[PDB]
Amino acid sequence: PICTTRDGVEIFYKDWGQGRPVVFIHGWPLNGDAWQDQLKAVVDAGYRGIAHDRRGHGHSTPVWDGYDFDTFADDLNDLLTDLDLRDVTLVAHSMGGGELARYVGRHGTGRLRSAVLLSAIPPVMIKSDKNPDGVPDEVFDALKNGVLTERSQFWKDTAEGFFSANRPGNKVTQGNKDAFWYMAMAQTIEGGVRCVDAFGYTDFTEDLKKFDIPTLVVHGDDDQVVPIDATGRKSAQIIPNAELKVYEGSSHGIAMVPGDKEKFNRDLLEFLNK
């Protein structure tokens, strides 16, 4: 289905089931198909599962502008308002965690019950003297140059790090890598590069302090994209009352990789009863 935003943008989304709503917010450079395993899991447990495609991704309008967290959060606000959703759990992966954080910062928690941050970017990714465990600027430069040099090959090469597929004995399939590429080919090239600038450099520390709902932070300690020590370990300390679950040996692609995705589904379903 399509939600038309305040600006006339069409946001595509899946809306399955009946019950309290669980809204899933995907990472770069994918789309709501990155959550089909979790959407089935929550609807089979008696929840309504919704997953939208960010502007410029999947089947949403291939826009030029608005690749910034304030716009992503307002687009999320339009979807929650159009469907008049209440008592919602927002579940976000990777840069989707910035959309979730900025939604709380801008619109508050009146429609929300709880939140889940899976392998998410808050509080801030960029390395500096204040954040010595963050990601160096050269990495973000390299991501943007990869998308501009030849994006199709770049997604094939990036899938290796995304799933930590360099680890001997991993459970990542060739299919996982092919599906990563398939989802990424639907993203605009401008969303490809502008999202890097947004997720690398935006600081969500002040938004995190406004959380007043139960929050679960899950993060793998072999995440080669979003470093656990700079992000998940810190957001769990800033968000009031947050719980942290470290997934030993897990990559950045926990929701899609065999074995890890069942562990996450089990944790998510336990948390949803809160």
Pairing of the two strands 243-247 and 21-25 = unpaired
Q: What are 2's strand-pairing partners?
A: 12
Of 145, 103, 146, nearest to 122 by C-alpha is 103
Which one, of 4, 259, 27, 62, lies nearest residue 158 by Cα? 27
202 token code pair: 């935006």
Task: Indicate the number of domains in the chain.
Answer: 1
DSSP assignment letter at 104 = H
For residues 37, 168, 125 and 72, what is the CA-based torsion angle, rounded to 10 degrees?
-20
CB under 8 A, 24+ apart: contacts of 228-231 = 229/133, 230/124, 230/125, 230/127, 230/131, 230/133, 230/134, 230/135, 231/120, 231/121, 231/122, 231/123, 231/125
Beta-carbon contacts of 69 under 8 Å, excluding residues fewer than 6 positions away, are 98, 99, 101, 102, 198, 202, 204
**Among 208, 193, 240, 236, residue whose Cα is nearest residue 103:** 208
DSSP 9: P
Cα–Cα distances in angstroms (integers) from residue 166 to residues 119, 120, 162, in the given order: 19, 21, 10
Query: Three-class SS of residue 190?
Result: helix
Taking the CA atoms of residue 168, residue 172, residue 174 and residue 176 in that order, the dihedral angle to the nearest 10 degrees is -150
Lookup result for tokens 């959407």: 39
Q: Three-class SS string for 207-240?
A: HHCCCCCCEEEEEECCCCCCCCCCCHHHHHHHCC
> Are 9 and 71 spatial neighbours (Cβ–Cβ below 8 Å)?
no
| 263: CATH | 3.40.50.1820
CB 55 within 8 A of CB 72: yes
> Which residues span the domain enclosing 201?
1-274
Catalytic residues: 94, 223, 252
Structure method: X-ray
